[PDB]
Write a protein that binds this ligand. Sequence first.
Ligand SMILES: Nc1ncnc2c1ncn2[C@@H]1O[C@H](COP(=O)(O)OP(=O)(O)O)[C@@H](O)[C@H]1O
Ligand SMILES: Nc1ncnc2c1ncn2[C@@H]1O[C@H](COP(=O)(O)OP(=O)(O)O)[C@@H](O)[C@H]1O
Ligand SMILES: Nc1ncnc2c1ncn2[C@@H]1O[C@H](COP(=O)(O)OP(=O)(O)O)[C@@H](O)[C@H]1O
Lengths: 250, 740
Amino acid sequence: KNRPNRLIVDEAINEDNSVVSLSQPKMDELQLFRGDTVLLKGKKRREAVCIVLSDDECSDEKIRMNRVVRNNLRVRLGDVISIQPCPDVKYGKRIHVLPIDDTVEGITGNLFEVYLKPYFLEAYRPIRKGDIFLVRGGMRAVEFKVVETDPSPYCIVAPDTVIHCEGEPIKREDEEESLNEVGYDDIGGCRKQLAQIKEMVELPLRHPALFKAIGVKPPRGILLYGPPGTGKTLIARAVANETGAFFFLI
Amino acid sequence: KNRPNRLIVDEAINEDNSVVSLSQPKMDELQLFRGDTVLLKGKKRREAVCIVLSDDECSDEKIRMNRVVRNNLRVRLGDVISIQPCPDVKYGKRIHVLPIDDTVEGITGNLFEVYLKPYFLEAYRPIRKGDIFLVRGGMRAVEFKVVETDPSPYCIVAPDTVIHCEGEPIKREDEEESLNEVGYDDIGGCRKQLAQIKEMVELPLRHPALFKAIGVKPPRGILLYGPPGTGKTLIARAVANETGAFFFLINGPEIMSKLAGESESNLRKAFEEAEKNAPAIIFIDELDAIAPKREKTHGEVERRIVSQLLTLMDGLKQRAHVIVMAATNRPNSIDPALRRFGRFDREVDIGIPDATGRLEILQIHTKNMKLADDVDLEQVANETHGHVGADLAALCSEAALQAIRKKMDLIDLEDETIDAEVMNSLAVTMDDFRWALSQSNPSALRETVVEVPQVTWEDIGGLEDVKRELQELVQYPVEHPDKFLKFGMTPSKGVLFYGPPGCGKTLLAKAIANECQANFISIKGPELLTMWFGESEANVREIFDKARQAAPCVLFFDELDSIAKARGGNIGDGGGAADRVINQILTEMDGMSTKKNVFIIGATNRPDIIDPAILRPGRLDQLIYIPLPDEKSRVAILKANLRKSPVAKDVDLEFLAKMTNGFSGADLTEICQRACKLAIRESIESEIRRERERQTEEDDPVPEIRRDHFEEAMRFARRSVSDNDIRKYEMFAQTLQQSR
Ligand SMILES: Nc1ncnc2c1ncn2[C@@H]1O[C@H](COP(=O)(O)OP(=O)(O)O)[C@@H](O)[C@H]1O
Ligand SMILES: Nc1ncnc2c1ncn2[C@@H]1O[C@H](COP(=O)(O)OP(=O)(O)O)[C@@H](O)[C@H]1O
Ligand SMILES: Nc1ncnc2c1ncn2[C@@H]1O[C@H](COP(=O)(O)OP(=O)(O)O)[C@@H](O)[C@H]1O
């Protein structure tokens, strides 16, 4: 559009899995409110709906996004997104959601009572078709994909609104990378070395054609070290998953 | 034509890529002017047009030519050229130039706007058909070939004249060697070893039929060495490209990876290939991987390949001008059977670069990076002690990547795709280099540095007679050998400075090593102690080996009494003054060459406990006593220390020298450093107080180190030598010089 409405995505710090946090300036400047719901459009015509918060630390051009919704938009870390305000709360009536067969196997139990009951309890969670969300509990982290929403194609669940959980779990799609995979959110005690590794492998992997178009030396060999079981292979797979580059393991 | 109009080409020093510089004499003598354009005819009926300049250093028969125009004439380095005057400026009208597809690929952008616009801006550049020129920018160096010129066949572009850049890039020709290849212009910090290598491989490669027509021994094996990533393979390819000799490259691990018997086939066939395409140069990279020492070889498969290499080296030296240059990290890490004559007889020590060399390396790698204006590579080159060429190359690339990473990638990430525009606009600030050099590069070497120290004679206050004696002892045997031979005297090869600590012994060593422009090797106390404790005195040999490899030199052992006082002082250990290390110093000093221009200097602030078997003739025998300064010298010391720091004008140094009596030369530096500390504290505190201004950002107060700052720095003055030590030195002098 070439006018300022696009933002750069980055890591998140909040424990809520269905919100996006933006800086107090960009909040007033984008003509938005605290708590107001919006649409986040990313790549491959896949948008979503989210809630906005305020965070002093995050900068203006930067937007906190946790891995679940960041993966939902089909975008990956370090890319650009378009935020559009939508105060059009089309309060839901019934949801048709089913789990995935891959994440749900052996799990003897009425999943409705055990997982979603405190999950959607007094939860004003907005949902749109094509959103694979997740909820944790019982030494498990279960994935749920919504197929059929009463308010088409998006809604917001009210505390009164029912949730309708009939059906068999569905086989996973070819264009969502599952969330049992590793990401930067998992690596706890190495947030400083992760800065170095991200700044080293950001440009060669995210922007490959750039180094084709420039005479400059890229970093080729990286030697991670440290005592065993510290998280080296973890960091490798995490970087591979976040930048989306193919990962061979020798 | 057999009359003087032909010249010898050689290297260039100017940064302009379309001119030739000639000596002021040959200028008047050839009937030419300064700036006048001429024709340069070379081989294969390919001439060019150029501009002439004046340069005092270049000699009469020699002509500065940079690699682009030198390659344009189809000639190579060391050949002869014909210069003809042509004041016929046939001022151009339109040019038809197109790039090469090889150099131009991926380069999204209007090349006309990004490269040629400031290139030909007010540029009176002469052009002729068949000229492939180049222009640098945007982390690229782009080649342009002219096909069709309005004034036929040559012209000169005026600032008014248009340049017409239509068409697709053309595929490169078979008889121009592309300029991404390496040449002598690229190698920065090895301009001295390059002289040796060029004089060694000039005649066998440039003039091959001459050695066929003469019975004389050619150099066959050359062993380049030095720490990794210093530029060995670079020098090899550079020599190969400049002399135009075929270059075969043998990689150590590559050959050593193949199966048993496949590797020897590869070596044999490689030598055959190089023999077939003579003149040739074989480069056996990482020789210490193929042929290590016999102790580290075990198993037939290794020794067999070493033997095969030996046999091939011995065989090649029958009627076959193939020079074999091999590279290794350390020379005493490879098989000693190789360094015997006929196989590897010439040895070259590349060594780590120095300050001027590092600055040159930086200029080489920032050649097309579009630096910012605040970039002062002097500071950088002064802060890169420990870096080799690979380190500096990676530093420049990392600074470039940081400049791409901060802005101009994420900023134009959302609006518009990649383009050449942003590449031109990237100015890499001095802060960026400060960051890249700050933490993100571990300097990859901590060896003994060999260089010509930057200390000069005015950096030292007082000690004039010691200066004339040092000049006499170091200079006269090299500058007037005939007097020494006539009078039969033998030139001494050693001095022993002695006196209070911190008075200028190391300063004098560096100064006299600088005045003669000879290398300097410092061997401090901790090193001798490390060789004594570790019980490895057999490293002393290696030290002297360096002094031989870098002749002329000044080998400087300071704190020579360190071992002598480590095992107790005057009484100390029950033994005598003979040590494990000092004995090796005696052995190596007695057994050096007759005159190899290596001048050993010692230093000791306790001359009574030094091993008296080193003060005997044939060894360090000139005892020079560095005394405590006087007022007329302390003034000079204070001036020489303070001349780098901005100091006020009302401060009287003569009063300081009056009050600071018997202060050793180090105390007069501690005073200045402490006063500078006080001034810096005041500056930062005033800065913070002016930052408490929140009522309204203004210029910092006058930073002249002022008086009444020394009045505080002087409060904490210490004398680092008692009168008792002065008395001891006095007694030493009195007894040893006057007793009987
Ligand atoms: N920094 C870390 N952050 C999160 N989990 C970790 C970390 N380090 C270790 N772990 C846990 O221990 C496992 C071991 O990690 P791994 O990459 O196999 O260690 P290494 O490769 O160093 O032997 C991880 O899979 C994870 O379960
Ligand atoms: N003396 C030098 N002059 C210019 N560039 C150098 C020099 N030394 C190293 N470099 C840079 O680092 C690279 C390493 O050179 P290389 O010949 O591979 O080192 P070595 O063979 O000693 O391991 C060169 O290609 C160049 O990019
Ligand atoms: N005569 C002098 N002239 C100039 N500077 C001196 C003089 N004497 C000592 N210094 C200062 O003392 C410092 C250390 O002196 P140094 O020569 O290392 O002592 P030593 O002679 O014991 O090796 C040097 O940085 C130098 O600036």
